[PDB]
Each structure stands twice: as structure tokens, then as C-alpha cells.
Design a protein around this ligand. Structure first.
Ligand SMILES: CS(=O)(=O)Cc1nc2ccccc2[nH]1
Length: 185
């Protein structure tokens, strides 16, 4: 692809993080902690899942960023509306204000309702995410496989400002402790 010139510097917003998460000092990495991280509760925090938002809000233009997923067994990535539900159980779908892909149990899927099987021959170690606000597009790229297309959501109805969205996943297996990292430009 040729989206690299729309690169944006994303940072994580601590205040939105599930209380288990550890965000690095530079706000560019996040991982699962092995306990509650000794923060107060607030209405922004995702309660049920190991999720966090980027600080940046987008309401126009073209935006691109990359995320390192090396050695993780489970994660979700994409964008979401600023006003998505934070508390309780919910599915990742455009109806609920999410445009995401995930890895779970050795398969990759797009967060449509119902979910869509992805066809990835080279397991990615870094994912590129492109948003075209005006066009209503969110696309995902396999940086490990020379930028090949993973998935395009088109005819998106964003219906609000967008935020970068992250889920580091659960670590029930002991094999999913590795962080999500925002890769340098
Ligand atoms: C099973 S676990 O992944 O190793 C620890 C954990 N349990 C959680 C419950 C809710 C949100 C995040 C959570 N992290």
C-alpha cells in the first residue's frame, strides 16, 4: 500500500484503561499486569476486558498507524467511536461502534456481525491500520507480508469522533503476556 505518508503518532490514554493494564511511561506500549494496578475506578475504564483507547480523536482526514503484536496468542485492534460502551459485556461490531480485527485460538477474524474469517498465510508481527474518515473506510495491512491487505470495512457509518482501539487479550494460558506496542514512524 501507499498510506504510510498519513502516519500519525498515537499515544495510549491511561484513564480509559482496564485497571489490570500497565501502560509504559512513553504511552506507546501496553501489557496485561498479573493483578489490579492500584488505580481509582472511573466511568471511562473498560471493566470486563483488557481494553484501552488512544488519546487522539479523529473526525476528518486520512490516518495511518502500526502496532506490534509479536508472540501474542490473542488481541483485538482497530478504531471505535468515542462513545462506545465501557461497562459490562458487549460484542465488537459496527452496530456497537467498533471497526476491528482479532486473533483468537489460532484464527484471524474481522469484527463484523457475525464475524468474518480472514485469510492470512504469513502470521503478522506488525499490523497497519488506515482510516479514511470521509470515505467511510477502515483497512488493515500485514506489515510482515510486504503490506498485503488483510481486511477493508467500507460504507462505515462512524457517527462520531473515532479513537484508536486496543485489546491486549486475556492471559489464562500464560502464553499471551507480551505487549501491544505502537511502532515508530
Ligand atoms: C485471566 S487474565 O487475563 O490472566 C487476568 C485478567 N482478568 C481480567 C478480567 C477482566 C478484565 C481484565 C482481566 N485480566
Amino acid at each position: 500500500h501507499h498510506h504510510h505518508h498519513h502516519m500519525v503518532h498515537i499515544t495510549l490514554d491511561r484513564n480509559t484503561a482496564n485497571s489490570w493494564l500497565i501502560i509504559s511511561k512513553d504511552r506507546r506500549q501496553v501489557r496485561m499486569g498479573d493483578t489490579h494496578q492500584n488505580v481509582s475506578d472511573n466511568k471511562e475504564r473498560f471493566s470486563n476486558y483488557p481494553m484501552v483507547l488512544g488519546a487522539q480523536r479523529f473526525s476528518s482526514g486520512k490516518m495511518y498507524w502500526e502496532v506490534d503484536v509479536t508472540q501474542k496468542e490473542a488481541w483485538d485492534l482497530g478504531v471505535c467511536r468515542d462513545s462506545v460502551q465501557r461497562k459490562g459485556q458487549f460484542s465488537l461490531s459496527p452496530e456497537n461502534g467498533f471497526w476491528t480485527i482479532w486473533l483468537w485460538q489460532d484464527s484471524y477474524e474481522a469484527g463484523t456481525s457475525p464475524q468474518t474469517t480472514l485469510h492470512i498465510q504469513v502470521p503478522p508481527c506488525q499490523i497497519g491500520i488506515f482510516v479514511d474518515y470521509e470515505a467511510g473506510v477502515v483497512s488493515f495491512y500485514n506489515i510482515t507480508d510486504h503490506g498485503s491487505l488483510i481486511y477493508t470495512f467500507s460504507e462505515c457509518v462512524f457517527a462520531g469522533p473515532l479513537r484508536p482501539f486496543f485489546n491486549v487479550g486475556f492471559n489464562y494460558s500464560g502464553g499471551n503476556a507480551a505487549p501491544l506496542k505502537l511502532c515508530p514512524l
